Amino acid sequence: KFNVRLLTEIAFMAALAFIISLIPNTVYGWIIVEIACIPILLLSLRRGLTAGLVGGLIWGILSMITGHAYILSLSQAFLEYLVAPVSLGIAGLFRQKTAPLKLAPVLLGTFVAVLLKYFFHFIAGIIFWSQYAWKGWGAVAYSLAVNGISGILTAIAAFVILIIFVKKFPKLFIHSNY
Ligand SMILES: CCCCCCCCCO[C@@H]1O[C@H](CO)[C@@H](O)[C@H](O)[C@H]1O
Ligand SMILES: Cc1ncc(C[n+]2cccc(CCO)c2C)c(N)n1
């Protein structure tokens, strides 16, 4: 967990997440597949909770200071661009330090982290985005559909990519000095 290498990986994955976040990802309206979560999920899985949290923090800051965040208020910004991307760090609780690498924990951490992130967007949807609720939908129903569907699709893409990495590059997930 040597500091320079550790800090470098953190910076690298936050930057990567930011850069991937520049790829168009809209399916319909605010229904998206947030492939940009993946670098942070990988960072968390490999390096653990704290690193993941910090990587998420950095990515969220980047989103906002480069003008790519959609901000409606300070509270909403804090929730959706600090709390939400930080919360991806929870994948770090499912880190595996010892080989052989198992698939299940990678999927569990991913599922839990994407769920938690989209849980905060869901809340945010109720509070701040209800004006956009499709005709005839109430605020909770709209937010669940929107953020529920985005969360699932996002978990799908994370699953696909991370499953390829587990089969191809299992070592991405296991940190070692040496
Ligand atoms: C106005 C506040 C901005 C300054 C406070 C710290 C900025 C957060 C990012 O820090 C570093 O910045 C590099 C370029 O910004 C990133 O590429 C790198 O990943 C990151 O580690
Ligand atoms: C109903 C609804 N619409 C929009 C948003 C905003 N939102 C949703 C998902 C992810 C993100 C972060 C950038 O990908 C944002 C800002 C919402 N929460 N709910």
SS3 55: helix
User: Which numeric CATH code is attached to 1-178?
Assistant: 1.10.1760.20
Domain ranges of the chain: 1-178
How far apart, in Å, are the Cα atoms of 16 and each of 38, 62, 105?
9, 11, 23
* DSSP 8-state assignment for residue 69: S
| CA–CA distances in Å: residue 66 to residues 58, 63, 102 | 12, 6, 38
Q: Which ligand is closest to the CA of 141, given by its number?
A: 2
Tell me how far apart the terminal alpha carbons of the chain are, to the nearest angstrom. 11
Tell me the residue type at 14. A
Q: What was the structure determination method?
A: X-ray
Ligand nearest to the CA of residue 26, numbered in listed order: 2
* 26 CA to centre of own chain: 16
Instruction: Evaluate: CB of 64 within 6 angstroms of ligand 1.
Output: no
Q: Name which of 94, 144, 139 is nearest 119 in CA terms.
A: 144
Tokens of 90: 């929870």
